[PDB]
Design a protein around this nucleic acid. Structure first.
Ligand code: K
Ligand code: MG
Ligand code: MG
Ligand code: MG
Ligand code: MG
Ligand code: MG
Ligand code: MG
Ligand code: MG
Ligand code: MG
Ligand code: MG
Ligand code: MG
Lengths: 130, 86, 25, 98, 213, 61
RNA sequence: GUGAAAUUCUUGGAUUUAUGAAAGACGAACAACUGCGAAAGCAUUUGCCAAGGAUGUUUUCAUUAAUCAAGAACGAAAGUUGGGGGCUCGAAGACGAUCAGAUACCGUCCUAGUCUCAACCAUAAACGAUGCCGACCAGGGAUCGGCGGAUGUUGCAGGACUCCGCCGGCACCUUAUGAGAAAUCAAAGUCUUUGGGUUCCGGGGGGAGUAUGGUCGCAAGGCUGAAACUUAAAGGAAUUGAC
């Protein structure tokens, strides 16, 4: 009912190219709204910009009120695996707008997939020369 | 402790050689000794090496005296130790 | 000129000379 | 001309040491030679913590930290101002800053 | 998200303090998509802080498994207990020795599960040494002690008591104080538990650990 | 349309130094402090209008 | 994915989310001016098998030793012959992009290869660019292994911790009264006041590690290895400018 919060899970996936805001059930097998930063921009370079994540977060906030989702569990992650592990530029704004757009936040965790010891990273032994 | 210019190598201090390596003393001397371990009961005359290597016993109950270790043999808490010398 | 590539050129010359000598025995 | 006594690395008493990959260019660098840093930061920064405080469901939720050990090759570390070029006499100064 | 789907509510096991755990969706009845089969999500990640209403245990995570859907509820059961990345990354510090042990103990209910313990050496109050390391010949004895204590407290009655000794630190404290003859061993507890195999539904033993709904 | 009062000036920034980064607080809500940038001449105690109040900034831009 | 894009995937559902199984590779964090090994090299647990240094010793033999032509073991990576495996990455190749041009740097898909077993090769900036054994010659603190002593705490004689000392090791800091062309080195010192033992090895720069012979290898190649001719400098360390 009112006051008592119905909880969804926001699987924010902020790489250096895009920013996915994906709201699912506690199980994660459902899906409430899944919008990327590339939907709200008309150039595929600006997808990772903070403002695109801002717009996408605004849209997820608008969608998640009609079904009663009154609070979110945020599971922020990055590319992970054998690739880069720091979250992308749009990771914070996407969170911040959630706070600003009248949305309650539960527990915040980082679920970037870390390997105990990964496969070979691409680029070669000399690395990506510029 | 400027250098050996103040001390005499012929007659060095009697306590500084209590700490040097046995080979490196003025005259090489052992660091071990022999001790007559006395058990709680009788049969108190058994003689054992300080840096022993074999687990010695006693005629009475075999009264295990010492365990060999990397250094001095580990005498038990129940066995009393006194040393014999030249 | 890098000495590595000079060594590579020398190796190519050596193998070509060997082939030429094997041609006529 | 030998610029450094240790050769730029930290190897003594061993012959081989497995490499790592620079976090920026993915270039193989020996583990001891690579510039390693440990950065610990809030998930949300000061401009964000204020807006996330009231948005939190309960006040007892402590804000979570994040910890990352990153490795950089010499080129990436110098270009990213992680370590600068120091003077000849200040090169030997191994004291960390502050 | 559609006009279809049903808003079900999950029911945590009776062992915790609060049973209400969020809400879930399922397709109502469309065709072969049965609601009963479709709601076998069988995995729910919770913090154990909500299930105990205490915030200091937020580092934990409980994996619940939906066993039987009945009466608009889901009737979950224990399926695992893990850690958040925050706590694990906070614990591992330089100038320290990390000791990790794991065993594959078995319970009476034929619930094959794997247990992991993690421990760290503790500096003494008067310590000038800046490393506080341990010799491998000592960490091996610590690992043996960890394994034997794990298999000692386990290999007993049903998992009810096993999770009754998981939400508190009974295994961890026992390992901590059973190894003080070797090292102080600060910050010792069970890192994670993995359920290797479940016996069967067994059709009723689940209701012995659930309330009247 | 969230009018803000300049609270402190953080020195001229930018390629040419044309933009000046400042910290502001809202007249509707005094307690909220944001960082923005402004062209032209700006002194402390001034009142500045805007359109979007959600954009953030960085120190010494 | 990119500084920006395209080559590529996608309403047959790409990317993303949750569960589960399989496969191969890899062992994060802990990880250090720390350990072991003749070097190459070695990092998940447990059991087995043989080996090893150091320490302790009032145990034993009694010169049995050091270095070594010839002759032998081992020797990263790449490479070769077959069998398996074949995740990721990726020489060759193809395509997109940039560019006056791009057989390159940047993207994507990929073959041999990367993993393993049985055999070959015998090379690396295989570096401490510093052969091995022995003696002496400044100080200091830290650290690893063992041992001796003292010490007073542990939810516990012993273990953890503190203090002192000895032997052995990896290093580090200060300073010459030393050396050196200097950088610098506590050994690269004890050198015209020149001699402890022994092995290898250099004689201005090219031609050239080339020609040829010999020899090992399936091959790629390895070991040994010139001459004619040409040249007045090549080179090392430091200094002041310029960039
Ligand atoms: K370094
Ligand atoms: Mg130079
Ligand atoms: Mg060694
Ligand atoms: Mg090497
Ligand atoms: Mg110890
Ligand atoms: Mg590991
Ligand atoms: Mg070690
Ligand atoms: Mg020979
Ligand atoms: Mg050579
Ligand atoms: Mg010691
Ligand atoms: Mg000559």
């Amino acid at each position: 009912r009112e006051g008592e919060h119905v909880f969804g899970v926001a699987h924010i996936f902020a790489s250096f190219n895009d920013t996915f805001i994906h709201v699912t059930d506690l199980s994660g097998r459902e899906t409430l709204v899944r919008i990327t930063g590339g939907m709200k921009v008309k150039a595929d370079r600006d997808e990772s910009s903070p403002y695109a994540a801002m717009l996408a977060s605004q849209d997820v906030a608008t969608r998640c009120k009609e079904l009663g989702i009154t609070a979110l569990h945020i599971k922020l992650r990055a590319t992970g695996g054998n690739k880069t592990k720091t979250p992308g530029p749009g990771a914070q704004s996407a969170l911040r707008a959630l706070a600003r757009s009248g949305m309650k936040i539960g527990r915040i965790e980082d679920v970037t997939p870390v390997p105990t010891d990964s496969t070979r990273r691409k680029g070669g032994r000399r690395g990506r020369r510029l | 402790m400027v250098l050996q210019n103040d001390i005499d190598l012929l007659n060095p201090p009697a306590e500084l050689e209590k700490l040097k390596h046995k080979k490196k003393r003025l005259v090489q001397s052992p660091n071990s000794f022999f001790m007559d371990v006395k058990c709680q009961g009788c049969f108190n005359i058994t003689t054992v090496f300080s840096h022993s290597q074999t687990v010695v016993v006693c005629p009475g109950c075999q009264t295990v005296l010492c365990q060999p270790t990397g250094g001095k043999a580990r005498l038990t808490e129940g066995c009393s130790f006194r040393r014999k010398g030249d | 000129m890098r000495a590595k590539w000079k060594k590579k050129r020398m190796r190519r010359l050596k193998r070509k000379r060997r082939k030429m000598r094997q041609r006529s025995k | 001309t030998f610029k450094r006594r240790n050769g730029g690395r930290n190897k003594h008493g061993r012959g081989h040491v497995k490499y790592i990959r620079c976090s920026n260019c993915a270039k193989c660098c020996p583990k001891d030679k690579a510039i390693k840093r440990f950065l610990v930061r809030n998930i949300v920064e000061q401009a964000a913590v204020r807006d996330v405080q009231e948005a939190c469901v309960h006040d007892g939720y402590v804000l979570p930290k994040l910890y990352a050990k990153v490795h950089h090759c010499v080129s990436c570390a110098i270009h990213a101002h992680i370590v600068r070029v120091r003077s000849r006499e200040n090169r030997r100064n191994r004291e960390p800053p502050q | 998200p559609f006009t279809k789907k049903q808003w079900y509510d999950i029911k945590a096991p009776l062992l915790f303090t609060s049973r209400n755990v969020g809400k879930t969706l399922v397709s109502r009845t469309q065709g072969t998509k049965i609601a009963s089969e479709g709601l076998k999500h069988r995995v729910f990640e919770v913090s154990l802080a909500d299930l105990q209403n205490d915030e200091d245990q937020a580092y934990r995570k409980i994996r619940l498994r939906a066993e039987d859907v009945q009466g608009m509820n889901v009737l979950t059961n224990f399926w695992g207990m893990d850690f958040t990345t925050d706590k694990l990354r906070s614990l591992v510090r330089k100038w320290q020795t990390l000791i990790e042990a794991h065993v594959d103990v078995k319970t009476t209910d034929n619930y094959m599960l794997r247990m992991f313990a993690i421990g760290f050496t503790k500096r003494r109050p008067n310590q000038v040494k800046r490393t506080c390391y341990a010799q491998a010949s000592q960490i091996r004895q610590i690992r043996r002690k960890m394994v034997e204590i794990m298999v000692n407290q386990a290999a007993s009655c049903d998992l009810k008591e096993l999770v009754n000794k998981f939400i508190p630190e009974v295994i961890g404290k026992e390992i901590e104080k059973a190894t003080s003859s070797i090292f102080p061993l600060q910050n010792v507890y069970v890192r994670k538990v993995k359920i290797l195999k479940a016996p069967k539904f067994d059709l009723g033993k689940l209701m012995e650990v659930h309330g009247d709904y | 349309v969230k009018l803000a009062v300049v609270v402190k000036v953080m020195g001229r920034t930018g390629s040419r130094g044309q933009v000046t980064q400042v910290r502001v607080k809202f007249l509707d809500d005094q307690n909220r402090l944001i960082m923005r940038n402004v062209k032209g001449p700006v002194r402390e105690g001034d009142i500045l209008t805007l359109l979007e109040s959600e954009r953030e900034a960085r120190r010494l831009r």
